[PDB]
Structures are given as structure tokens and as C-alpha cells.
Amino acid sequence: PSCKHCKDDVNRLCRVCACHLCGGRQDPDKQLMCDECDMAFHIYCLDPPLSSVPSEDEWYCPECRND
Amino acid sequence: ARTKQT
Ligand SMILES: [Zn+2]
Ligand SMILES: [Zn+2]
Ligand SMILES: [Zn+2]
Ligand SMILES: [Zn+2]
């Protein structure tokens, strides 16, 4: 398994290799990769949720965001 | 920004 946490089970949530907030794998085109920690985040799982993917070069997740 | 798909 590429991921030791969920063993690549598609029917299992995994906050390590899929959305770090909800554990879901759907919509990878809508999953933002943090430029610091490299975790994935659905745009619609963020608080606040984004209606689209940001055009900006770099993006930092809520855990890494420098307030 | 970079997505999972990329
Ligand atoms: Zn996993
Ligand atoms: Zn999510
Ligand atoms: Zn991060
Ligand atoms: Zn976390």
C-alpha cells in the first residue's frame, strides 16, 4: 500500500492521503495541495469554503497559514 | 494553485 494508514482502501476515509479535513477522495481537481505541509484539502471543506480553485501561485492550508 | 489531480 502506498498509504499505510488506509491501505489504499477506496471505501475508507483517509485524512493522510485524501482530504485532510474530511478524508474523502472525490474531486481531486478540487483538492488544494498545501505548499508547506503538502496535505490535500477540498475547496468546499475549508472554512471559509472556496467556490473555486485560487489562481494564485502558492496556497497555504489553515494549519500552515501565517495568520 | 496546485491540486491533487496535478
Ligand atoms: Zn490513506
Ligand atoms: Zn474534504
Ligand atoms: Zn499545510
Ligand atoms: Zn491536521
Side-chain angles (χ1 to χ4, degrees), chain A residues 1-65 67, chain B:
Chain A
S2 179
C3 183
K4 81 220 236 197
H5 301 274
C6 69
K7 306 184 194 282
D8 293 357
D9 188 344
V10 73
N11 289 138
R12 238 235 87 210
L13 294 187
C14 185
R15 294 179 173 81
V16 164
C17 72
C19 178
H20 185 64
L21 300 175
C22 78
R25 307 174 193 273
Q26 84 277 190
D27 303 320
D29 53 315
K30 297 184 181 183
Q31 295 180 34
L32 303 186
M33 305 294 302
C34 178
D35 284 309
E36 176 172 339
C37 76
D38 205 42
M39 296 284 173
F41 300 78
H42 285 124
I43 58 176
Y44 49 63
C45 284
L46 292 169
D47 182 358
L50 310 177
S51 316
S52 62
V53 177
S55 195
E56 12 272 299
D57 305 312
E58 310 110 50
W59 175 86
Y60 304 96
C61 82
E63 308 179 342
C64 304
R65 275 163 159 89
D67 324 85
Chain B
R2 193 176 27 124
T3 65
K4 183 61 162 167
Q5 189 161 91
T6 165

Coordinates of all heavy atoms in Angstrom, one line a residue, unseen atoms left out:
Chain A
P1 N 0.8 -1.2 0.0 CA 0.0 0.0 0.0 C 0.9 1.3 0.0 O 1.8 1.4 0.8 CB -0.8 -0.1 1.3 CG -0.7 -1.5 1.7 CD 0.5 -2.1 1.2
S2 N 0.6 2.2 -0.9 CA 1.2 3.5 -0.9 C 0.9 4.2 0.4 O 1.8 4.9 1.0 CB 0.8 4.3 -2.1 OG 1.4 5.6 -2.1
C3 N -0.3 4.0 0.9 CA -0.6 4.7 2.2 C -0.8 3.6 3.3 O -1.7 2.8 3.2 CB -1.9 5.5 2.1 SG -2.3 6.4 3.7
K4 N 0.0 3.7 4.4 CA 0.0 2.7 5.5 C -1.2 2.9 6.4 O -1.6 2.1 7.1 CB 1.3 2.8 6.3 CG 1.2 4.0 7.3 CD 2.6 4.6 7.4 CE 3.2 4.7 8.8 NZ 4.3 5.7 8.9
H5 N -1.8 4.1 6.3 CA -2.9 4.5 7.2 C -4.2 3.8 6.8 O -4.9 3.2 7.6 CB -3.1 6.0 7.4 CG -1.8 6.7 7.9 ND1 -1.6 6.8 9.3 CD2 -0.8 7.2 7.3 CE1 -0.4 7.4 9.4 NE2 0.1 7.7 8.2
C6 N -4.6 3.9 5.5 CA -5.8 3.3 5.0 C -5.6 2.1 4.1 O -6.6 1.5 3.6 CB -6.6 4.4 4.2 SG -5.7 4.8 2.6
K7 N -4.4 1.8 3.8 CA -4.0 0.6 2.9 C -4.7 0.8 1.5 O -4.9 -0.2 0.8 CB -4.4 -0.7 3.6 CG -3.8 -0.8 5.0 CD -4.0 -2.1 5.7 CE -3.7 -2.1 7.2 NZ -2.3 -2.3 7.5
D8 N -4.9 2.0 1.1 CA -5.4 2.3 -0.3 C -6.8 1.8 -0.5 O -7.2 1.6 -1.6 CB -4.4 1.7 -1.3 CG -3.1 2.4 -1.4 OD1 -2.9 3.4 -0.6 OD2 -2.2 2.0 -2.2
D9 N -7.5 1.5 0.6 CA -8.9 1.1 0.5 C -9.8 2.3 0.1 O -9.9 3.3 0.8 CB -9.4 0.6 1.9 CG -10.8 0.0 1.8 OD1 -11.5 0.2 0.9 OD2 -11.1 -0.7 2.8
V10 N -10.4 2.2 -1.1 CA -11.2 3.3 -1.7 C -12.5 3.6 -0.9 O -13.0 4.7 -0.9 CB -11.5 3.0 -3.1 CG1 -12.6 1.9 -3.2 CG2 -12.0 4.2 -3.9
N11 N -12.9 2.6 -0.1 CA -14.1 2.8 0.7 C -13.9 3.3 2.1 O -14.8 3.3 2.9 CB -14.9 1.5 0.7 CG -15.6 1.2 -0.6 OD1 -15.6 0.1 -1.1 ND2 -16.1 2.3 -1.3
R12 N -12.6 3.6 2.4 CA -12.2 4.0 3.7 C -11.8 5.5 3.6 O -11.2 6.0 2.6 CB -10.9 3.3 4.1 CG -11.0 2.5 5.4 CD -9.9 2.9 6.4 NE -10.3 4.1 7.2 CZ -9.5 5.0 7.7 NH1 -8.2 5.0 7.4 NH2 -10.0 6.0 8.4
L13 N -12.2 6.3 4.6 CA -11.8 7.7 4.7 C -10.3 7.7 5.0 O -9.8 6.8 5.7 CB -12.5 8.4 5.9 CG -14.0 8.6 5.8 CD1 -14.5 9.5 6.9 CD2 -14.3 9.2 4.4
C14 N -9.6 8.6 4.5 CA -8.2 8.8 5.0 C -7.7 10.3 4.9 O -7.6 10.9 3.9 CB -7.2 7.9 4.2 SG -5.5 8.1 4.9
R15 N -7.5 10.8 6.1 CA -7.1 12.2 6.2 C -5.6 12.4 5.9 O -5.1 13.5 6.1 CB -7.5 12.8 7.5 CG -9.0 12.9 7.7 CD -9.5 13.5 9.0 NE -10.9 13.7 9.1 CZ -11.8 12.7 9.3 NH1 -11.3 11.5 9.6 NH2 -13.1 13.0 9.3
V16 N -4.9 11.4 5.6 CA -3.5 11.4 5.3 C -3.2 11.5 3.8 O -2.5 12.4 3.3 CB -2.7 10.2 5.9 CG1 -1.3 10.1 5.2 CG2 -2.6 10.4 7.4
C17 N -3.8 10.6 3.0 CA -3.6 10.6 1.6 C -4.8 11.2 0.8 O -4.7 11.3 -0.5 CB -3.2 9.2 1.1 SG -4.6 8.0 1.1
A18 N -5.9 11.5 1.4 CA -7.0 12.1 0.7 C -7.3 13.5 1.5 O -6.4 14.0 2.2 CB -8.2 11.3 0.7
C19 N -8.5 14.0 1.4 CA -8.8 15.3 2.0 C -8.5 15.3 3.5 O -9.0 14.5 4.3 CB -10.2 15.7 1.8 SG -10.6 17.4 2.6
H20 N -7.6 16.2 3.9 CA -7.1 16.2 5.3 C -8.2 16.6 6.3 O -8.2 16.3 7.5 CB -5.9 17.1 5.4 CG -5.3 17.1 6.8 ND1 -4.7 15.9 7.4 CD2 -5.1 18.1 7.7 CE1 -4.2 16.2 8.6 NE2 -4.5 17.5 8.8
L21 N -9.3 17.2 5.8 CA -10.4 17.7 6.6 C -11.5 16.6 6.7 O -12.0 16.3 7.8 CB -11.0 19.0 6.1 CG -10.0 20.2 6.1 CD1 -10.6 21.5 5.5 CD2 -9.5 20.4 7.5
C22 N -11.9 16.0 5.6 CA -13.0 15.0 5.6 C -12.6 13.6 5.3 O -13.4 12.6 5.4 CB -14.1 15.5 4.6 SG -13.7 15.1 2.9
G23 N -11.3 13.4 4.8 CA -10.9 12.0 4.5 C -11.3 11.5 3.1 O -11.0 10.4 2.8
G24 N -12.1 12.3 2.4 CA -12.7 11.9 1.1 C -11.8 12.0 -0.1 O -10.9 13.0 -0.1
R25 N -11.9 11.1 -1.0 CA -11.0 11.1 -2.2 C -11.6 11.7 -3.5 O -10.9 11.8 -4.5 CB -10.7 9.6 -2.5 CG -10.2 8.8 -1.3 CD -10.0 7.3 -1.7 NE -9.8 6.6 -0.4 CZ -8.6 6.4 0.1 NH1 -7.5 6.9 -0.5 NH2 -8.4 5.8 1.3
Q26 N -12.9 12.0 -3.5 CA -13.6 12.5 -4.7 C -13.1 13.9 -5.0 O -12.5 14.7 -4.2 CB -15.1 12.6 -4.4 CG -15.7 13.8 -3.6 CD -15.6 13.7 -2.0 OE1 -16.1 14.5 -1.3 NE2 -14.8 12.7 -1.5
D27 N -13.2 14.3 -6.3 CA -12.9 15.7 -6.8 C -11.4 16.0 -6.6 O -11.2 17.1 -6.0 CB -13.8 16.7 -6.1 CG -15.2 16.5 -6.4 OD1 -15.6 16.1 -7.5 OD2 -16.0 16.7 -5.4
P28 N -10.5 15.2 -7.0 CA -9.1 15.6 -6.8 C -8.7 16.9 -7.6 O -7.8 17.6 -7.2 CB -8.3 14.4 -7.4 CG -9.2 13.8 -8.3 CD -10.6 13.9 -7.7
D29 N -9.5 17.3 -8.6 CA -9.4 18.6 -9.3 C -9.8 19.8 -8.4 O -9.5 20.9 -8.7 CB -10.2 18.6 -10.6 CG -11.6 18.2 -10.4 OD1 -11.9 17.2 -9.7 OD2 -12.5 18.8 -11.0
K30 N -10.4 19.5 -7.3 CA -10.9 20.5 -6.3 C -10.2 20.3 -5.0 O -10.5 21.0 -4.0 CB -12.4 20.4 -6.1 CG -13.2 20.6 -7.3 CD -14.7 20.6 -6.9 CE -15.6 20.8 -8.2 NZ -17.1 20.9 -7.8
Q31 N -9.1 19.5 -4.9 CA -8.3 19.3 -3.7 C -7.1 20.2 -3.8 O -6.2 19.9 -4.7 CB -7.9 17.8 -3.5 CG -9.1 16.9 -3.3 CD -8.7 15.5 -3.1 OE1 -7.6 15.2 -2.6 NE2 -9.5 14.5 -3.6
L32 N -6.9 21.1 -3.0 CA -5.8 22.0 -3.0 C -4.6 21.4 -2.2 O -4.9 20.9 -1.1 CB -6.1 23.4 -2.4 CG -7.2 24.2 -3.0 CD1 -7.3 25.6 -2.3 CD2 -7.0 24.3 -4.5
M33 N -3.4 21.4 -2.7 CA -2.2 20.8 -2.1 C -1.5 22.0 -1.3 O -1.1 22.9 -2.0 CB -1.3 20.2 -3.1 CG -2.0 19.2 -3.9 SD -2.5 17.8 -2.9 CE -0.9 17.3 -2.3
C34 N -1.3 21.8 0.0 CA -0.7 22.9 0.7 C 0.8 23.0 0.3 O 1.5 22.0 0.2 CB -0.7 22.7 2.2 SG 0.1 23.9 3.2
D35 N 1.3 24.2 0.0 CA 2.7 24.4 -0.4 C 3.7 24.3 0.8 O 4.9 24.3 0.5 CB 2.8 25.7 -1.2 CG 2.3 25.6 -2.6 OD1 2.7 24.6 -3.3 OD2 1.5 26.4 -3.0
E36 N 3.2 24.1 2.0 CA 4.1 23.8 3.1 C 4.1 22.4 3.6 O 5.1 21.7 3.5 CB 3.9 24.8 4.3 CG 4.7 24.5 5.5 CD 4.6 25.5 6.6 OE1 4.2 26.7 6.4 OE2 5.0 25.1 7.8
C37 N 2.9 21.9 4.0 CA 2.8 20.6 4.6 C 2.4 19.5 3.5 O 2.5 18.3 3.8 CB 1.7 20.5 5.7 SG 0.0 20.6 5.1
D38 N 2.0 20.0 2.3 CA 1.7 19.1 1.2 C 0.5 18.2 1.5 O 0.3 17.2 0.8 CB 2.9 18.2 0.8 CG 2.7 17.7 -0.6 OD1 2.4 18.5 -1.5 OD2 3.0 16.5 -0.9
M39 N -0.4 18.5 2.4 CA -1.7 17.8 2.6 C -2.7 18.3 1.6 O -2.5 19.4 1.0 CB -2.2 17.9 4.0 CG -1.3 17.3 5.1 SD -1.5 15.5 5.1 CE -0.2 15.1 6.3
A40 N -3.7 17.5 1.3 CA -4.8 17.9 0.4 C -6.0 18.4 1.1 O -6.3 17.9 2.2 CB -5.2 16.8 -0.6
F41 N -6.7 19.4 0.5 CA -7.9 20.0 1.1 C -9.0 20.3 0.0 O -8.7 21.1 -0.9 CB -7.6 21.3 1.8 CG -6.6 21.1 3.0 CD1 -5.3 21.0 2.7 CD2 -7.1 21.2 4.3 CE1 -4.4 20.9 3.8 CE2 -6.2 21.0 5.3 CZ -4.8 20.9 5.1
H42 N -10.2 19.7 0.2 CA -11.2 20.1 -0.7 C -11.5 21.6 -0.6 O -11.5 22.1 0.6 CB -12.5 19.3 -0.4 CG -12.5 17.9 -0.8 ND1 -12.8 16.9 0.0 CD2 -12.4 17.3 -2.1 CE1 -12.8 15.7 -0.6 NE2 -12.5 16.0 -1.9
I43 N -11.7 22.3 -1.7 CA -12.0 23.8 -1.5 C -13.3 23.9 -0.7 O -13.4 24.9 0.1 CB -12.2 24.5 -2.9 CG1 -13.3 23.8 -3.7 CG2 -10.9 24.5 -3.7 CD1 -13.6 24.5 -5.1
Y44 N -14.2 23.0 -0.9 CA -15.5 23.1 -0.2 C -15.5 22.7 1.3 O -16.4 22.8 2.0 CB -16.6 22.5 -0.9 CG -16.4 21.1 -1.4 CD1 -16.1 20.0 -0.5 CD2 -16.4 20.8 -2.8 CE1 -15.9 18.7 -1.0 CE2 -16.1 19.5 -3.2 CZ -15.9 18.5 -2.3 OH -15.7 17.2 -2.8
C45 N -14.3 22.1 1.7 CA -14.2 21.7 3.1 C -13.5 22.8 4.0 O -13.5 22.7 5.2 CB -13.4 20.4 3.2 SG -14.3 18.9 2.8
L46 N -12.9 23.7 3.3 CA -12.2 24.8 4.0 C -13.2 25.7 4.7 O -14.4 25.6 4.4 CB -11.4 25.7 3.0 CG -10.2 25.0 2.3 CD1 -9.7 25.8 1.2 CD2 -9.1 24.7 3.4
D47 N -12.7 26.4 5.7 CA -13.5 27.4 6.4 C -12.7 28.7 6.4 O -11.8 28.9 7.1 CB -13.8 26.9 7.9 CG -14.7 27.9 8.7 OD1 -15.1 29.0 8.2 OD2 -15.0 27.5 9.8
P48 N -13.2 29.7 5.6 CA -14.3 29.6 4.7 C -14.1 28.7 3.4 O -12.9 28.7 2.9 CB -14.5 31.0 4.2 CG -13.1 31.6 4.2 CD -12.5 31.0 5.4
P49 N -15.1 28.1 2.9 CA -15.0 27.3 1.7 C -14.9 28.2 0.5 O -15.5 29.3 0.4 CB -16.4 26.6 1.6 CG -17.3 27.5 2.4 CD -16.5 28.1 3.5
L50 N -14.1 27.7 -0.5 CA -13.9 28.5 -1.7 C -14.8 27.9 -2.8 O -14.9 26.7 -2.9 CB -12.4 28.4 -2.2 CG -11.4 28.7 -1.1 CD1 -10.0 28.5 -1.7 CD2 -11.5 30.1 -0.6
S51 N -15.4 28.8 -3.6 CA -16.3 28.4 -4.7 C -15.5 27.9 -5.9 O -16.0 27.3 -6.8 CB -17.3 29.5 -5.1 OG -17.8 30.1 -4.0
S52 N -14.2 28.4 -6.0 CA -13.4 27.8 -7.0 C -11.9 27.7 -6.6 O -11.5 28.2 -5.5 CB -13.5 28.6 -8.3 OG -13.1 29.9 -8.1
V53 N -11.1 27.0 -7.4 CA -9.7 26.9 -7.1 C -9.0 28.3 -7.3 O -9.2 28.9 -8.3 CB -9.0 25.9 -8.0 CG1 -7.5 25.9 -7.7 CG2 -9.7 24.5 -7.7
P54 N -8.2 28.7 -6.3 CA -7.5 30.0 -6.4 C -6.5 30.0 -7.5 O -5.7 29.1 -7.7 CB -6.8 30.2 -5.0 CG -7.4 29.1 -4.2 CD -7.8 28.0 -5.0
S55 N -6.4 31.2 -8.2 CA -5.4 31.3 -9.3 C -4.0 31.6 -8.8 O -3.0 31.4 -9.6 CB -5.9 32.4 -10.3 OG -5.1 32.4 -11.5
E56 N -3.9 32.0 -7.6 CA -2.6 32.3 -7.0 C -1.6 31.2 -7.1 O -1.9 30.0 -7.0 CB -2.7 32.8 -5.6 CG -4.1 32.6 -5.0 CD -5.1 33.7 -5.2 OE1 -4.8 34.9 -4.8 OE2 -6.1 33.5 -5.9
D57 N -0.3 31.5 -7.3 CA 0.8 30.5 -7.3 C 0.8 29.6 -6.1 O 0.6 28.4 -6.3 CB 2.2 31.2 -7.3 CG 2.3 32.2 -8.4 OD1 2.0 32.0 -9.6 OD2 2.8 33.4 -8.1
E58 N 1.0 30.2 -5.0 CA 1.2 29.4 -3.7 C -0.1 29.5 -2.9 O -0.8 30.5 -2.9 CB 2.4 29.9 -2.9 CG 3.6 30.0 -3.8 CD 4.0 31.5 -4.0 OE1 4.1 32.2 -3.0 OE2 4.3 31.8 -5.2
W59 N -0.4 28.4 -2.2 CA -1.5 28.4 -1.3 C -1.1 27.6 0.0 O -0.5 26.6 -0.1 CB -2.7 27.7 -2.0 CG -3.9 27.5 -1.1 CD1 -4.9 28.4 -0.8 CD2 -4.1 26.4 -0.2 NE1 -5.7 27.9 0.1 CE2 -5.3 26.7 0.5 CE3 -3.5 25.1 -0.1 CZ2 -5.9 25.7 1.3 CZ3 -4.1 24.2 0.8 CH2 -5.3 24.5 1.5
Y60 N -1.4 28.2 1.2 CA -1.1 27.5 2.4 C -2.4 27.2 3.2 O -3.3 28.0 3.3 CB -0.1 28.4 3.3 CG 1.1 28.7 2.5 CD1 1.3 29.9 1.9 CD2 2.2 27.8 2.5 CE1 2.4 30.2 1.2 CE2 3.4 28.1 1.8 CZ 3.5 29.3 1.1 OH 4.6 29.6 0.4
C61 N -2.4 26.0 3.7 CA -3.6 25.4 4.4 C -3.8 26.1 5.7 O -2.9 26.8 6.2 CB -3.5 23.9 4.6 SG -2.5 23.5 6.1
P62 N -5.0 26.0 6.3 CA -5.3 26.6 7.6 C -4.3 26.3 8.7 O -4.1 27.1 9.6 CB -6.7 26.0 8.0 CG -7.2 25.6 6.7 CD -6.1 25.1 5.9
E63 N -3.7 25.1 8.7 CA -2.7 24.8 9.7 C -1.4 25.5 9.5 O -0.7 25.8 10.5 CB -2.5 23.3 9.8 CG -3.8 22.5 9.9 CD -3.7 21.0 9.9 OE1 -2.6 20.5 9.5 OE2 -4.7 20.4 10.4
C64 N -1.0 25.7 8.3 CA 0.3 26.3 7.9 C 0.1 27.9 7.7 O 1.1 28.6 7.8 CB 0.9 25.6 6.8 SG 1.2 23.9 7.0
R65 N -1.1 28.3 7.4 CA -1.3 29.7 7.1 C -0.7 30.6 8.2 O -0.9 30.4 9.4 CB -2.9 30.0 7.1 CG -3.6 29.8 5.7 CD -5.1 29.7 5.9 NE -5.9 30.0 4.7 CZ -6.3 29.1 3.8 NH1 -5.9 27.8 3.9 NH2 -7.0 29.4 2.7
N66 N 0.2 31.6 7.7 CA 0.7 32.5 8.7 C -0.3 33.6 8.8 O -0.3 34.6 8.1 CB 2.0 33.1 8.1
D67 N -1.3 33.4 9.8 CA -2.3 34.3 10.1 C -2.3 35.6 9.3 O -3.4 36.1 8.9 CB -2.3 34.6 11.6 CG -1.9 33.3 12.4 OD1 -0.7 33.1 12.6 OD2 -2.8 32.6 12.9
Chain B
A1 N -3.1 27.6 -8.2 CA -2.6 26.7 -7.1 C -2.6 25.2 -7.6 O -3.3 24.8 -8.5 CB -3.4 26.9 -5.8
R2 N -1.8 24.4 -6.9 CA -1.6 23.0 -7.2 C -2.8 22.2 -6.6 O -3.1 22.4 -5.4 CB -0.3 22.6 -6.6 CG 0.2 21.2 -7.1 CD 1.6 21.0 -6.5 NE 1.7 21.7 -5.2 CZ 2.0 21.2 -4.0 NH1 2.3 19.9 -3.9 NH2 2.1 22.0 -3.0
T3 N -3.4 21.4 -7.4 CA -4.4 20.5 -7.0 C -3.9 19.0 -6.9 O -2.8 18.7 -7.4 CB -5.7 20.5 -7.9 OG1 -5.3 20.0 -9.2 CG2 -6.2 21.9 -8.0
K4 N -4.7 18.2 -6.3 CA -4.3 16.8 -6.2 C -4.2 16.1 -7.5 O -3.3 15.3 -7.8 CB -5.3 15.9 -5.3 CG -4.9 14.5 -5.1 CD -3.6 14.1 -4.4 CE -3.5 12.7 -3.9 NZ -2.1 12.2 -3.5
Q5 N -5.1 16.5 -8.5 CA -5.0 16.0 -9.8 C -3.7 16.4 -10.5 O -3.3 15.7 -11.5 CB -6.2 16.5 -10.6 CG -6.4 15.8 -11.9 CD -7.8 15.9 -12.5 OE1 -8.1 16.9 -13.2 NE2 -8.7 15.0 -12.1
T6 N -3.1 17.5 -10.1 CA -1.8 17.8 -10.6 C -0.7 17.8 -9.5 O -0.2 16.7 -9.2 CB -1.8 19.3 -11.2 OG1 -0.4 19.7 -11.4 CG2 -2.5 20.2 -10.3
Ligands
ZN1 ZN -4.5 6.9 3.2
ZN2 ZN -12.8 17.3 2.1
ZN3 ZN -0.3 22.9 5.4
ZN4 ZN -4.1 18.5 10.6

